[PDB]
Scaffold this active site. Structure first.
Site, mmCIF file in Angstrom:
data_model
loop_
_atom_site.group_PDB
_atom_site.id
_atom_site.type_symbol
_atom_site.label_atom_id
_atom_site.label_comp_id
_atom_site.label_asym_id
_atom_site.label_seq_id
_atom_site.Cartn_x
_atom_site.Cartn_y
_atom_site.Cartn_z
ATOM 1 N N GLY A 169 8.224 2.171 2.246
ATOM 2 C CA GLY A 169 7.048 1.720 2.986
ATOM 3 C C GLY A 169 7.167 0.289 3.496
ATOM 4 N N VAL A 212 3.635 -1.437 4.503
ATOM 5 C CA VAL A 212 2.255 -1.866 4.726
ATOM 6 C C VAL A 212 1.687 -2.543 3.488
ATOM 7 C CG1 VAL A 212 -0.020 -1.222 5.605
ATOM 8 C CG2 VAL A 212 2.012 0.032 6.371
ATOM 9 N N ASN A 258 0.131 10.359 7.578
ATOM 10 C CA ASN A 258 -0.412 9.568 8.693
ATOM 11 C C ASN A 258 -1.884 9.882 9.025
ATOM 12 O OD1 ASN A 258 2.033 8.221 8.891
ATOM 13 N ND2 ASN A 258 2.795 9.519 10.538
ATOM 14 N N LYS A 278 1.443 -4.467 8.456
ATOM 15 C CA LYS A 278 2.776 -3.888 8.418
ATOM 16 C C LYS A 278 3.849 -4.963 8.700
ATOM 17 C CE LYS A 278 4.131 -0.579 11.354
ATOM 18 N NZ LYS A 278 3.499 0.686 11.834
ATOM 19 N N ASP A 303 3.874 12.268 15.396
ATOM 20 C CA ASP A 303 4.137 12.210 13.961
ATOM 21 C C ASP A 303 2.923 12.575 13.091
ATOM 22 O OD1 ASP A 303 6.080 12.074 11.988
ATOM 23 O OD2 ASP A 303 6.419 9.919 12.148
ATOM 24 N N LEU A 356 0.823 -1.200 0.000
ATOM 25 C CA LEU A 356 0.000 0.000 0.000
ATOM 26 C C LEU A 356 0.866 1.263 0.000
ATOM 27 C CD1 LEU A 356 -2.789 -1.268 2.431
ATOM 28 C CD2 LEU A 356 -3.032 -0.828 -0.049
ATOM 29 N N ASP A 367 -0.233 5.293 12.467
ATOM 30 C CA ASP A 367 1.191 5.241 12.739
ATOM 31 C C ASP A 367 1.542 5.754 14.129
ATOM 32 O OD1 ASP A 367 3.894 4.712 12.581
ATOM 33 O OD2 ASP A 367 4.260 5.878 10.769
#
Ligand code: 5BS
Ligand code: NA
Ligand code: NA
Length: 275
Positions: free
Chosen positions: A12, A14, A124, A29, A119, A10, A137
């Site tokens: 990275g 994930v 996110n 993840k 974050d 997706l 996240d």
């Protein structure tokens, strides 16, 4: 482990996946062995102790070939950064207010549970197919023991609050500064200083004045004042998520239905390039 049919990446780390028996689409993840595994449990623990439609849910985890796979809630529209990249278009004020109202409700929930996301950025903030924004996240998220401060200089440089960088104490309103930088990122496609070296930007965030729009003449009085209320360099005089949900820019947000066209467009572009 073979209870999910892992599909494409997706974006990275994930992946899209299907829970084989219930049919439910999940986001998994892939986390390596050499990762700070105490920090991974801290990440999962924060997700578990959260029960809000504005925060991404944790389903479970499994080990496969030394990797830890973390099963989480799948949001069909992707991140607000994915939608800006896919369409090659920045967001109009109506879109920003609606997404940011839900983001503020997630922030309000997190901060009530004495947690700092640390974050917040367009990457996110994830949207589901219906158009609901969710916080995602929690890999860098900190927990406050009481109304307590944190000292870890952590997050992503362009979105970091000045007091986080200054090494003086910091609490939940450090996320409100990041929300302000994110609002500019949705309006302009990039945060302030995006084309400068991130370590050079880290150095000037506490000395430079609060960032403003690149072309202030294109934005309304409400959006510029909302961003001004987010980007207050002194954290004790910075608005909380509860107060920002009363600010005219947020109080006047249109319903989630106004996002349908950007979601349909972004999803159509993703599908067309997949073939
Ligand atoms: C579980 N989760 C996350 O924690 C985060 S936080 C930052 C990224 C992720 N990722 C990638 C995810 N992608 C999704 N959904 C999703 C759906 C579509 C697309 S697209 N259209 O850009 O290919 C991307 C992600 N849904 C959820 C996540
Ligand atoms: Na950030
Ligand atoms: Na700017």
């Amino acid at each position: 482990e073979e209870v999910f049919d892992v599909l494409e990446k997706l974006g990275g780390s994930v992946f899209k996946a299907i829970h084989k028996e219930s049919g439910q689409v999940v986001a998994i993840k892939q986390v390596p062995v050499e990762s700070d595994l105490q920090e991974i449990i801290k990440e999962i623990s924060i997700m578990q102790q959260c029960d809000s439609p504005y925060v991404v849910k944790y389903y479970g985890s499994y080990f496969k070939n030394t990797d830890l796979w973390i099963v989480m809630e799948y949001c069909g529209a992707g991140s607000v950064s994915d939608i800006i990249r896919l369409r090659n278009k920045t967001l109009i004020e109506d879109e920003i207010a609606t997404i940011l109202k839900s983001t503020l409700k997630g922030l309000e929930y997190l901060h009530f549970m004495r947690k700092i996301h640390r974050d917040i950025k367009a990457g996110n903030i994830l949207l589901n197919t219906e158009g609901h924004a969710k916080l995602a996240d929690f890999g860098v998220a900190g927990q406050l023991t009481d109304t307590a401060k944190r000292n870890t200089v952590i997050g992503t440089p362009f979105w970091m609050a000045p007091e986080v960088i200054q090494e003086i104490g910091y609490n939940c309103v450090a996320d409100i500064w990041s929300l302000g930088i994110t609002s500019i990122e949705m309006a302009e496609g990039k945060p302030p200083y995006a084309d400068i070296h991130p370590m050079r930007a880290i150095f000037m965030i506490p000395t430079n004045p609060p960032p403003t729009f690149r072309k202030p003449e294109l934005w309304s009085d409400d959006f510029t004042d909302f961003v001004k209320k987010c980007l207050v360099k002194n954290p004790e005089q910075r608005a909380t998520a509860t107060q920002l949900l009363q600010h005219p820019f947020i109080k006047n947000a249109k319903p989630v239905s106004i996002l349908r066209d950007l979601i349909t467009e972004a999803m159509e572009i993703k599908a067309k390039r997949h073939e």
